[PDB]
Design an enzyme around this catalytic site. Sequence first.
Site, PDB file in Angstrom:
ATOM      1  N   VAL A   1       0.878  -1.198   0.000  1.00 45.28           N
ATOM      2  CA  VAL A   1       0.000   0.000   0.000  1.00 45.28           C
ATOM      3  C   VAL A   1       0.902   1.232   0.000  1.00 45.28           C
ATOM      4  O   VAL A   1       1.940   1.224   0.697  1.00 45.28           O
ATOM      5  CB  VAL A   1      -0.984   0.009   1.180  1.00 45.28           C
ATOM      6  CG1 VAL A   1      -1.945   1.190   1.084  1.00 45.28           C
ATOM      7  CG2 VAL A   1      -1.767  -1.294   1.291  1.00 45.28           C
ATOM      8  N   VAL A   2       0.532   2.259  -0.757  1.00 48.66           N
ATOM      9  CA  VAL A   2       1.352   3.497  -0.911  1.00 48.66           C
ATOM     10  C   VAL A   2       0.638   4.648  -0.227  1.00 48.66           C
ATOM     11  O   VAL A   2      -0.566   4.854  -0.487  1.00 48.66           O
ATOM     12  CB  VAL A   2       1.660   3.827  -2.371  1.00 48.66           C
ATOM     13  CG1 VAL A   2       2.667   4.973  -2.465  1.00 48.66           C
ATOM     14  CG2 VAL A   2       2.166   2.597  -3.119  1.00 48.66           C
TER      15      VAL A   2
ATOM     16  N   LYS B   1       5.766   3.369   0.220  1.00 48.63           N
ATOM     17  CA  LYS B   1       5.178   2.038  -0.047  1.00 48.63           C
ATOM     18  C   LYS B   1       5.543   1.164   1.158  1.00 48.63           C
ATOM     19  O   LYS B   1       6.755   0.922   1.364  1.00 48.63           O
ATOM     20  CB  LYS B   1       5.717   1.446  -1.346  1.00 48.63           C
ATOM     21  CG  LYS B   1       5.089   0.123  -1.755  1.00 48.63           C
ATOM     22  CD  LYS B   1       5.462  -0.315  -3.149  1.00 48.63           C
ATOM     23  CE  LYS B   1       4.318  -1.014  -3.860  1.00 48.63           C
ATOM     24  NZ  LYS B   1       4.818  -2.018  -4.830  1.00 48.63           N
TER      25      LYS B   1
ATOM     26  N   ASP C   1       6.488  -6.176 -15.364  1.00 51.50           N
ATOM     27  CA  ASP C   1       5.130  -5.768 -14.900  1.00 51.50           C
ATOM     28  C   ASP C   1       4.743  -4.394 -15.465  1.00 51.50           C
ATOM     29  O   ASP C   1       4.270  -3.533 -14.730  1.00 51.50           O
ATOM     30  CB  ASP C   1       5.014  -5.840 -13.380  1.00 51.50           C
ATOM     31  CG  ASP C   1       3.575  -6.082 -12.931  1.00 51.50           C
ATOM     32  OD1 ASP C   1       2.677  -6.451 -13.805  1.00 51.50           O
ATOM     33  OD2 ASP C   1       3.338  -5.865 -11.725  1.00 51.50           O
TER      34      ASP C   1
HETATM   35  C1  LIG Z   1       0.327   5.025  -5.394  1.00 49.93           C
HETATM   36  C2  LIG Z   1       0.043   5.747  -6.686  1.00 49.93           C
HETATM   37  C3  LIG Z   1      -1.046   5.061  -7.490  1.00 49.93           C
HETATM   38  O1  LIG Z   1       1.129   5.569  -7.574  1.00 49.93           O
HETATM   39  C4  LIG Z   1      -0.156   7.240  -6.482  1.00 49.93           C
HETATM   40  C5  LIG Z   1      -1.413   7.698  -6.524  1.00 49.93           C
HETATM   41  C6  LIG Z   1      -1.641   9.080  -6.452  1.00 49.93           C
HETATM   42  N1  LIG Z   1      -2.731   9.785  -6.501  1.00 49.93           N
HETATM   43  N2  LIG Z   1      -2.386  11.103  -6.424  1.00 49.93           N
HETATM   44  C7  LIG Z   1      -3.409  12.133  -6.486  1.00 49.93           C
HETATM   45  C8  LIG Z   1      -3.738  12.190  -7.980  1.00 49.93           C
HETATM   46  C9  LIG Z   1      -4.859  13.167  -8.254  1.00 49.93           C
HETATM   47  C10 LIG Z   1      -4.442  14.586  -7.842  1.00 49.93           C
HETATM   48  C11 LIG Z   1      -5.704  15.483  -7.933  1.00 49.93           C
HETATM   49  O2  LIG Z   1      -5.311  16.560  -8.784  1.00 49.93           O
HETATM   50  C12 LIG Z   1      -3.881  14.671  -6.394  1.00 49.93           C
HETATM   51  C13 LIG Z   1      -2.914  13.526  -6.033  1.00 49.93           C
HETATM   52  C14 LIG Z   1      -1.061  11.238  -6.280  1.00 49.93           C
HETATM   53  C15 LIG Z   1      -0.509   9.988  -6.311  1.00 49.93           C
HETATM   54  C16 LIG Z   1       0.780   9.451  -6.237  1.00 49.93           C
HETATM   55  C17 LIG Z   1       0.963   8.110  -6.348  1.00 49.93           C
HETATM   56  N3  LIG Z   1       2.264   7.513  -6.358  1.00 49.93           N
HETATM   57  C18 LIG Z   1       3.458   8.079  -6.044  1.00 49.93           C
HETATM   58  O3  LIG Z   1       3.655   9.239  -5.714  1.00 49.93           O
HETATM   59  C19 LIG Z   1       4.623   7.200  -6.191  1.00 49.93           C
HETATM   60  C20 LIG Z   1       5.877   7.740  -6.511  1.00 49.93           C
HETATM   61  C21 LIG Z   1       6.922   6.881  -6.684  1.00 49.93           C
HETATM   62  C22 LIG Z   1       6.710   5.501  -6.566  1.00 49.93           C
HETATM   63  C23 LIG Z   1       5.432   5.060  -6.272  1.00 49.93           C
HETATM   64  C24 LIG Z   1       5.118   3.615  -6.067  1.00 49.93           C
HETATM   65  F1  LIG Z   1       6.074   2.770  -6.530  1.00 49.93           F
HETATM   66  F2  LIG Z   1       5.064   3.330  -4.727  1.00 49.93           F
HETATM   67  F3  LIG Z   1       3.906   3.233  -6.519  1.00 49.93           F
HETATM   68  N4  LIG Z   1       4.463   5.906  -6.100  1.00 49.93           N
END
Ligand SMILES: CC(C)(O)c1cc2nn([C@H]3CC[C@H](CO)CC3)cc2cc1NC(=O)c1cccc(C(F)(F)F)n1
Length: 297
Positions: free
Chosen positions: A37-38, A51, A149
Amino acid sequence: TRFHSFSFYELKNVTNNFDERPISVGGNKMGEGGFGVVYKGYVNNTTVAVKKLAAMVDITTEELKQQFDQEIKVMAKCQHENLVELLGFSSDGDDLCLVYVYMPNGSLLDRLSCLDGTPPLSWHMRCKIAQGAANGINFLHENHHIHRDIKSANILLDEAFTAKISDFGLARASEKFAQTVMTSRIVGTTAYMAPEALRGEITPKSDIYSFGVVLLEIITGLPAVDEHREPQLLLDIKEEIEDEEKTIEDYIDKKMNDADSTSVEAMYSVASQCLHEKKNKRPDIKKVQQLLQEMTA
Ligand SMILES: CC(C)(O)c1cc2nn([C@H]3CC[C@H](CO)CC3)cc2cc1NC(=O)c1cccc(C(F)(F)F)n1
Ligand SMILES: [Cl-]
């Protein structure tokens, strides 16, 4: 070396104890998959993604630890504007955490579904995202890594919608890229996987097939699998179009007003070539790169 070693308790602090409410509602939870979960955090004024690894599907503690180690090894070797950036990790006590620079526009999967009311991606932005994702895969293949993946949930988007490949936990080194090996532990996401990958082969050609499915998601805005849809698998639309039961124009995302026939058919043509059932007939990532560059002239 270069990554910060955090104590688990510090990461507990900066994620508000891994707060499970969505970020859209003031919580810390951003998304999840089979291996964890992130969560959103703030470390020293830096917005981070944390994560926390877990057995969300059936996987051993040992396999989870190998994925953690492989993520750190690939991120230590590979820095590129179309790859996510690891800042640190924690491995004290039972739990494993990886800490990354935060991606303000989340996953390509979430943006194609307009999750949380985000506006639909323009065709112009979709073309730039496809190009950036192909540049990231090209960097991995040039550095003798197979991702294994590739999917829209693993292509993240920064504040300018620059595409960044994520999740290197299943990545494998290839001996000078040319030589295919077999594994007895078949991993990946079924709706994205080449036939040879579903039989246990490990080859960069499987990354190209998975990227073909991502190009269809970009064109259609449909998920790779939907159990309440016919066809359930997005890759089956290729057969429907080849057997002239349909055209790409029948599947184009309606949530765009700037999609011209010419560039959409050019992107469909790249997707179609990536989705060859015979791995040796697929273009390599360099050719995919060239075709996507020619598409935007
Ligand atoms: C977890 C997920 C799906 O990837 C993620 C979902 C998000 N949603 N939003 C919202 C989007 C909509 C916006 C409205 O304007 C406001 C913010 C920001 C996000 C950021 C994310 N991931 C990361 O920052 C990230 C970076 C590096 C490595 C990874 C890892 F490997 F762990 F998956 N994750
Ligand atoms: Cl699988």
